[PDB]
């Protein structure tokens, strides 16, 4: 019985990391075998280049950085397939959707070109989108000094996310991320339990193909 592949997406400060940590904790406490993954995975060679870029310690050509973000997902595919095959549900904090939405927010980047590198990745069984007004997301303290940490860019990224949500091949679920940490968590936990129990009857799919 394979594990489910659950992705959490949303703009910066939507609560993705907090909810991904709480979800794994709750699933494990309820007897599931579940583990947390995140993208970018900054521990690899590629992940280190990505981290320097995001921190503005380095500059990288836009197409190149887009391809490094996708390569950082592919390098984890053998691990993802192994874990899911062993029955381990994986909770992923950002995935290909963030990749497309952030690069697609830049000038002269078509959604189509941005999607291609991630075509064929393991297809999530559930994609949770943590919806929150950008204003309230900004009021979750203040902007940091990392790349993309500004309102106009966040708004273009959000528009790209909405284009991706038209894709009916994917099991998108909207989450009202404006509620408390515990209320949002319960919403996410119940959706995840349902996906683990019913979405896994079919083989792992391939993204965007
Ligand atoms: N439901 C919530 N209500 C209020 N604050 C929240 C809520 N969820 C998370 N936060 C707070 O908002 C901040 C950002 O949360 P978190 O790190 O989980 O977001 P994120 O989506 O991972 O952000 P990033 O996009 O930068 O990685 C944290 O200080 C966190 O405690
Ligand atoms: C996974 C991923 C994240 N990003 C961005 C979103 C965030 O602004 C940034 C840091 O992510 P984080 O908010 O998860 O720490 O990286 C990309 O631009 N492309 C990607 O493929
Ligand atoms: Mg985070
Ligand atoms: Mg084509």
UniProtKB/Swiss-Prot annotation:
Top enzyme class: transferase
An example Gene Ontology CC term for this record: cytoplasm
Annotated residues for binding of ATP: 13-18, 94, 179, 189
Pfam families on file: Thymidylate_kin
UniProt pathway annotation: Pyrimidine metabolism; dTTP biosynthesis
GO molecular function, one term: dTMP kinase activity
Span list, region LID: 130-154
EC id: 2.7.4.9
Top-level taxon: Eukaryota
A biological process from GO: dTTP biosynthetic process
Key words of the record: Acetylation, ATP-binding, Disease variant, Intellectual disability, Kinase, Neurodegeneration, Nucleotide biosynthesis, Nucleotide-binding, Transferase
Cofactor: Mg(2+)
Documented effect of changing residue 96 to T: In CONPM; uncertain significance
Modified residues (N6-acetyllysine): 166
InterPro entries noted in UniProt: P-loop_NTPase, Thymidylate_kin-like_dom, Thymidylate_kin_CS, Thymidylate_kinase
Reactions it catalyzes: dTMP + ATP = dTDP + ADP
HAMAP family: Thymidylate_kinase
NCBIfam families, A to Z: DTMP_kinase (TIGR00041)
Oligomeric and partner information: Homodimer.
Function: Catalyzes the phosphorylation of thymidine monophosphate (dTMP) to thymidine diphosphate (dTDP), the immediate precursor for the DNA building block dTTP, with ATP as the preferred phosphoryl donor in the presence of Mg(2+).
Disease involvement: Neurodegeneration, childhood-onset, with progressive microcephaly: An autosomal recessive disorder characterized by global developmental delay apparent from infancy. Most severely affected individuals have severe and progressive microcephaly, early-onset seizures, lack of visual tracking, and almost no developmental milestones, resulting in early death. Less severely affected individuals have a small head circumference and severely impaired intellectual development with poor speech and motor delay.
Stated family: Belongs to the thymidylate kinase family.
UniProt protein name: Thymidylate kinase
Gene name of this polypeptide: DTYMK
């Amino acid at each position: 019985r394979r594990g489910a592949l659950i992705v959490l997406e949303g703009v910066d400060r939507a609560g993705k990391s907090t909810q991904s940590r709480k979800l794994v904790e709750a699933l494990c406490a309820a007897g599931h075998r579940a583990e947390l993954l995140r993208f970018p995975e900054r521990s690899t060679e590629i992940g280190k280049l990505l981290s320097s870029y995001l921190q503005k310690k380095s500059d990288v050509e836009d197409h190149s950085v887009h391809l490094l973000f996708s390569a950082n997902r592919w390098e984890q595919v053998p691990l993802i397939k192994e874990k899911l095959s062993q029955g381990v549900t994986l909770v992923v904090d950002r995935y290909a959707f963030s990749g497309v939405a952030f690069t697609g927010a830049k000038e002269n980047f078509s959604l189509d070109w941005c999607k291609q590198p991630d075509v064929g990745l393991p297809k999530p069984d559930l994609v949770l989108f943590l919806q929150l007004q950008l204003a309230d997301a900004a009021k979750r303290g203040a902007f940091g000094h990392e790349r993309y940490e500004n309102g106009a860019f966040q708004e273009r990224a959000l528009r790209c996310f909405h284009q991706l949500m038209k894709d009916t091949t994917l099991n998108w679920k909207m989450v009202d991320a404006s509620k408390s940490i515990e209320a949002v968590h319960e919403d996410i936990r119940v959706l995840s339990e349902d996906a683990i129990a019913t979405a896994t009857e079919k083989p792992l799919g391939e993204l965007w193909k």
